[PDB]
Each structure stands twice: as structure tokens, then as C-alpha cells.
Design an enzyme around this catalytic site. Structure first.
Site, PDB file in Angstrom:
ATOM      1  CE1 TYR A  78      -4.177  -6.682   4.438  1.00 39.76           C
ATOM      2  CE2 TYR A  78      -4.938  -6.693   6.740  1.00 39.76           C
ATOM      3  CZ  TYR A  78      -4.755  -7.268   5.400  1.00 39.76           C
ATOM      4  OH  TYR A  78      -5.475  -8.376   5.051  1.00 39.76           O
ATOM      5  CD  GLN A 136      -7.189  -4.381   4.067  1.00 38.29           C
ATOM      6  OE1 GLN A 136      -7.662  -5.501   3.770  1.00 38.29           O
ATOM      7  NE2 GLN A 136      -6.336  -3.959   3.189  1.00 38.29           N
ATOM      8  NE  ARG A 192     -12.658 -10.959   4.860  1.00 40.37           N
ATOM      9  CZ  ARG A 192     -12.076 -10.672   3.639  1.00 40.37           C
ATOM     10  NH1 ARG A 192     -10.587 -10.913   3.775  1.00 40.37           N
ATOM     11  NH2 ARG A 192     -12.479 -10.873   2.385  1.00 40.37           N
ATOM     12  CD  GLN A 219     -10.869  -7.226   4.713  1.00 36.91           C
ATOM     13  OE1 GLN A 219      -9.697  -7.115   4.973  1.00 36.91           O
ATOM     14  NE2 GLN A 219     -11.389  -7.504   3.668  1.00 36.91           N
ATOM     15  CE1 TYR A 228      -3.083  -2.952   0.057  1.00 36.66           C
ATOM     16  CE2 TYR A 228      -3.575  -2.625   2.309  1.00 36.66           C
ATOM     17  CZ  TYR A 228      -3.767  -3.261   1.292  1.00 36.66           C
ATOM     18  OH  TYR A 228      -4.624  -4.405   1.243  1.00 36.66           O
ATOM     19  CB  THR A 246      -8.330 -12.992  -0.444  1.00 35.07           C
ATOM     20  OG1 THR A 246      -8.183 -11.733  -0.059  1.00 35.07           O
ATOM     21  CG2 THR A 246      -8.825 -13.976   0.768  1.00 35.07           C
TER      22      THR A 246
END
Ligand code: FAD
Ligand code: NAG
Ligand code: NAG
Ligand code: ZN
Ligand code: ZN
Ligand code: ZN
Ligand code: ZN
Length: 479
Positions: free
Chosen positions: A433, A388, A249, A357, A76, A133
């Protein structure tokens, strides 16, 4: 040719591929995933072997520039670029070979991505690994920071399966690492993030692809008070009851809060687990997804439109500001403040959107928590929760407001609702993150907490001149 770039001249001499700055290749690999933090590298090498990586590192040394490995480019803060302009970038996505031996050990090159990797493990012996994911995510960045997903509660972090690696050091040397060879560096690579070495190949243990996986989703219709009561119930459950084979989550936004995850078992058994907690959480909810599938199936359940099989042809982008947090069990103040913030301070203009999340990271039966903070560089084994925070600008091509000037205060305040209630030593963030607003000093403490001093000493040993450092990475500081 190497016009106007002495590094490219060096790379050409070493027979290492590179992108001229006027090329389409540069447009693709030289443009960050997150357009809000796009940077201009000093040069872009495209190594195809361990030797190529070392040769490229030598060229960077000759130039006197820092060098940043780029795996999948999904950081990020664009750390594949170094998090700022002027670093020699080593685009590794052409190195994605995956090979599983008769011992079920998988060799994965440093530029491989999650989707391609998952496919190869399945094709080669029906094996699986614990990972995120997103199919586009690079295995490299993923494992170095942890590697979290729907298999973490059951099988831990991606780094919990790493048993070795072939890496290139800051002096261009090439070494092998494992729990028995250069063990300190191996420890640092398992959670220390970027800047310790450039990994050419990872060696992973694997588990058999489960015969059955049940994916699920619970949709709530909770008001302010119900959010608080529900979260309190889920917290007690997460810490004392949630089974090893279940992951969860909470997907949270301005008008919803949904539970979702995977269950390494059948649907009938899963419903018997969900029913009790749904009741304890105050009802006002229902199962909105419940289906049995296999490993391939669950992987394809969380792609969100992304291509599953991605290698070196990747050119996807977004414009956003993200943040994260890790924390121990929370008091009512943290929960109430978080909820109040969602209800009273989360209004955004059309074209802008956000989501959070709430990850069931630790807990009594979490495999992640079965490993101590001393066993790998990952420093959040003692934290029950991981979050997150994502602030997206959908119409960024037309309007980025309030960015780049401001907007950060929205999620920073959201994080604060919970973080402000924690003892200083329990405040953390997850490097995968990343929060780009942090200083290098703040980032190091939040991302690596109790393991920071040890990591800094290891960094001092393996990269004393901080050749591989980025704007928030572990600094070389001997004890
Ligand atoms: C965009 C995106 C990110 C996601 C997604 N889903 C995630 C999930 O389900 N779980 C997670 O735990 N993380 C998810 N992430 C977050 C992060 O993007 C990832 O976890 C990784 O950090 C990204 O890895 P990668 O794509 O390789 O990132 P880069 O920006 O290329 O580099 C990151 C970083 O670490 C270094 N590095 C990468 N590769 C190497 C190698 N081979 N050797 C050494 N160092 C390497 C970089 O130098 C830098 O410091 C879902 C989506 C859509
Ligand atoms: C994924 O794409 C690669 C291209 O590099 C190809 O070699 C591989 O066969 C593909 N895997 C599939 C379609 O399962
Ligand atoms: C959140 O909104 C409330 C409105 O009820 C306001 O009182 C408070 O100051 C806001 N906090 C901020 C600006 O983060
Ligand atoms: Zn030219
Ligand atoms: Zn430039
Ligand atoms: Zn069980
Ligand atoms: Zn307080």
C-alpha cells in the site's frame, strides 16, 4: 519490427515478444493502473518462459537501463514500471500457469493473478492460499511485499506459505531459491518488495479449502466520543482476545465505521464472539451481514465488481493517492486525534471520496504475529495494526483537482494523527500500500524498518548495480 527501439531489436533477436510503442498492446500494458502515476517505459517485453525473462534482462543490460518486472500492475506507485519513466518493463501476465502436485505444493508462474490462482487451486485438489481480496492483483508483487487479507489472522501472509522459487538475477543468471538454497535471497524475496530478482515461478505450500467460512459485517452508529471508546475496546480485544480463526478490518469513511471479516467456522459460534465485543465497544451497532458459505463464496464476497478470472486481458484504471501505516498498540492521543481528523478534517469536494481500512494485523492470536521479524524480510510482525488510506478522484476524466498539484496533505495528515505519537523506530508503512510522496531513504526505513540493513546487504550481493531497482526500493549497501 524494432523501429526506433534498440531494445526491441535485441528482444526480436532473442525471439522474445515485445510491444511496439505505437500498438494497442502498449496502450494496455504501458498504461499504469493508477493514472495519476502513469509512466513511459523504455520498452515492454512479454516473456513466456524463464529463459525469455533472462534473455530480456540481458537486453536491458545491453541497453544500460533499469529493468522492472510487472506482475498484475496493481502497485499504487506503478512499480511494475519502476516508478518512473525509462525502465525496460517485463510484462509477465502471460506467464500464469498454476499446478498443484500430489504433495499439495502449488507451482505458480510470476505473472499469475489472485483470482485465477484461487480458481485453479480449488479446481486442482480443493486447495487454498492466504492472499488479498482483489482478483486482479499479481501474485508476484503481492507475495514479495507480504500479501494481506481476510485469511491473514488465521493463516498469515501470502509469503508465509512460500517454500521456493525460480528466479532471474540482475546478471541474467537463473537460480533456484528456498530456505536451504540461496537462503538469503529467499529471505529477501519474502517481504523485501521489488528489485531483488525477477521471479519466473513461485512454489507454495497450500492448505485445504475450508469447508465453511462465515463472512460478517457490523454497522456502527457512533458519534465522536463513541468512536474513541469503541476503538479502545476493539484494541484491547484485538491484542488479548480475538481468536485465531477470525479476521477483522474496520471500513471507515466520512459517515461510517463498519467492522467486517471472515470466520473460519460457523455463524452461531461467530455471533457468540461478536456479541461480547459489540457490547464492550459501547453498543450502538448491529450485525448487518452474517452468512455461511465456502471458500469460493468468500472470495466472491470481496470482488467489488472486478472480474474474478483475470489473466492477460486487463485494462482497468483508477486515479487516486494512497498511503499506509503500521503501528503498535495506540495511546488515547493517537485514537482521539484520528477520530478528530475524521470528524473535522475529512471534507472533500463532490467527485472525490475517501476511505480507510483499519486492519487487525497483529495480536496474541494472529498467525502473522506467530512469525518473528527475523524469520522473513517482512518487518512488521511486532505491529498490532495496519492501515490503508485511500483518496479517490471519481470524476478524474473531467477534473483531477486538487491533483496533481496537491491533495496529498489530506491523507498525510490523517496518517500523522497516529504516526506522530509513535517512537521513531515503530513508525512503519506497508509496501503493498505504497505512498508515492516518500523519498527512497524514507521509504526504505518505513517499509522495512529493522530488516533494512540486512536487506541492503542482500541487495548488494544479488543486484550490486541496482539493475532491478525502482524509486523507493532497497538499495545495494554492503555492511
Ligand atoms: C489495485 C489493487 C491492489 C491491491 C488490492 N487488494 C490488496 C489486498 O487485499 N491485500 C494486499 O496486501 N494488497 C492488495 N493490493 C495492494 C498491491 O497492489 C498488491 O499487494 C501487490 O503489491 C500488487 O502486485 P502486482 O499486481 O504484481 O504489482 P506490480 O505493480 O505489477 O508490481 C509490484 C512490484 O513487485 C514486483 N513484481 C511483481 N511481480 C513480480 C515477479 N514475478 N518477480 C519479481 N518482481 C515482481 C514489481 O517489479 C514491483 O516492485 C486490490 C486492488 C484492486
Ligand atoms: C479463466 O480464463 C482462462 C483464460 O486464460 C481459461 O483458460 C480458464 O479456463 C478460465 N477459468 C475458469 C472459467 O474457471
Ligand atoms: C482540522 O480542523 C480543525 C477545525 O476544528 C482545525 O482547527 C485544524 O487546524 C484542522 N487541521 C488540519 C488543517 O489538518
Ligand atoms: Zn513499427
Ligand atoms: Zn515513450
Ligand atoms: Zn476458536
Ligand atoms: Zn503527542
Amino acid at each position: 519490427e524494432a523501429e526506433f527501439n534498440s531494445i526491441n531489436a535485441c528482444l526480436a533477436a532473442a525471439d522474445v515478444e515485445f510491444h511496439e510503442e505505437d500498438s494497442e498492446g502498449w496502450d494496455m500494458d504501458g498504461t499504469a493502473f493508477n493514472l495519476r502515476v502513469d509512466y513511459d517505459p523504455a520498452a515492454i517485453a512479454i516473456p513466456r518462459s524463464t529463459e525469455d525473462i533472462a534473455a530480456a534482462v540481458q537486453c536491458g543490460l545491453d541497453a544500460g537501463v533499469q529493468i522492472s518486472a510487472k506482475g498484475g500492475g496493481h502497485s499504487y506507485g506503478s512499480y511494475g514500471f519502476g516508478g518512473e519513466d525509462g525502465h525496460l518493463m517485463l510484462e509477465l501476465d502471460r506467464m500464469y500457469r498454476v499446478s498443484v502436485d500430489d504433495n499439495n505444493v502449488a507451482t505458480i508462474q510470476g505473472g499469475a493473478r489472485l483470482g485465477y490462482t484461487a480458481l485453479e487451486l480449488l479446481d486442482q485438489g480443493n486447495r487454498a492460499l492466504s492472499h488479498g481480496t482483489c482478483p486482479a492483483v499479481g501474485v508476484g508483487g503481492h507475495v514479495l511485499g507480504g500479501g494481506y487479507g481476510f485469511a491473514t489472522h488465521t493463516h498469515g501472509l501470502t509469503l508465509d506459505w512460500l517454500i521456493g522459487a525460480t528466479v532471474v538475477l540482475a546478471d541474467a543468471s537463473i537460480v533456484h531459491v528456498s530456505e536451504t538454497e540461496n537462503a538469503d535471497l529467499f529471505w529477501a524475496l519474502r517481504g523485501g518488495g521489488g528489485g531483488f530478482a525477477i521471479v519466473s515461478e513461485f512454489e507454495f505450500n497450500t492448505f485445504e479449502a475450508p469447508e465453511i467460512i462465515t463472512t460478517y459485517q457490523v454497522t456502527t452508529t457512533w458519534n465522536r466520543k463513541q468512536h474513541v471508546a469503541g476503538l479502545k475496546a476493539l484494541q484491547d480485544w484485538a491484542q488479548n482476545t480475538m481468536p485465531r480463526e477470525l479476521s477483522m478490518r474496520l471500513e471507515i469513511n466520512a459517515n461510517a465505521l463498519n467492522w467486517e471479516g471472515n470466520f473460519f467456522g460457523n455463524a452461531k459460534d461467530l455471533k457468540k464472539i461478536l456479541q461480547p465485543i459489540m457490547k464492550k465497544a459501547g453498543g450502538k451497532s448491529t450485525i448487518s451481514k452474517l452468512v455461511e458459505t465456502d471458500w469460493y463464496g468468500q472470495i466472491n464476497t470481496y470482488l467489488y465488481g472486478a472480474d474474478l478470472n483475470i489473466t492477460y486481458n486487463y485494462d482497468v484504471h483508477e486515479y487516486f493517492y494512497a498511503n499506509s501505516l503500521t503501528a503498535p498498540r495506540l495511546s488515547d492521543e493517537a485514537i482521539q486525534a484520528f477520530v478528530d481528523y475524521k470528524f473535522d478534517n475529512s471534507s472533500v469536494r463532490p467527485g472525490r471520496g475517501w476511505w480507510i481500512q483499519w486492519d487487525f494485523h497483529g495480536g496474541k492470536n494472529s498467525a502473522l504475529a506467530a512469525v518473528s521479524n527475523d524469520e522473513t524480510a517482512y518487518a512488521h510482525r511486532d505491529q498490532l495494526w495496519l492501515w490503508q488510506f485511500y483518496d479517490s478522484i471519481y470524476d478524474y476524466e473531467n477534473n483531477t483537482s486538487p491533483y496533481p498539484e496537491s491533495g496529498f496533505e489530506f491523507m498525510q495528515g490523517f496518517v500523522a494523527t497516529i504516526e506522530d505519537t509513535l517512537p521513531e523506530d515503530r513508525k512503519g508503512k506497508y509496501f503493498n500500500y505504497a505512498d508515492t510522496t516518500l523519498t527512497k531513504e524514507e521509504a526504505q526505513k518505513l517499509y522495512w524498518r529493522g530488516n533494512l540493513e540486512k536487506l541492503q546487504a542482500i541487495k548488494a550481493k544479488y543486484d550490486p548495480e541496482d539493475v532491478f531497482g525502482n524509486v523507493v526500493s532497497v538499495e545495494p549497501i554492503a555492511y
